[PDB]
């Protein structure tokens, strides 16, 4: 009775284990800091109790005496995937398994 949907069952196994892999391998969010900055590797641990993040840029001084500021940047980046299309695909697989088995 299920002999002919075993292909679809394998496909559902794969389409689920690869999302478990995506969930397990990548990092959900990170603070991203950019720029020529001194970051104390110990102060970064206080990141959870911090309220103000202050980034002071490097001031480069030219041989001709001109002063100019490096770029500094800060923000959170987060892991994301195509939920709409993977859910539509796994919904279709599940629906087809139930349809063909009645």
């Amino acid at each position: 009775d299920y002999e002919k949907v075993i292909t679809l069952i394998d496909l559902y196994d794969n389409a689920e284990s690869d999302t478990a892999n995506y969930m397990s391998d990548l990092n959900d969010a990170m603070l991203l800091i950019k720029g020529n900055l001194n970051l104390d590797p110990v102060e970064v641990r206080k990141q959870k109790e911090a309220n103000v993040l202050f980034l002071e840029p490097t001031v480069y001084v030219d041989a001709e005496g001109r002063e100019t500021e490096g770029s500094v940047d800060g923000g959170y980046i987060y892991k994301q995937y195509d939920v709409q299309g993977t859910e539509a695909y796994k919904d279709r697989l599940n629906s087809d398994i139930h349809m063909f088995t009645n």
Partner: peptide
């Protein structure tokens, strides 16, 4: 030379990231 002594010359100062 006298002016260079009185003014000196600034040098590249590296930035800081602080979480307070």
């Amino acid at each position: 030379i006298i002016d260079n002594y009185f003014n000196a010359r600034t040098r590249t100062k590296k930035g800081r990231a602080v979480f307070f």
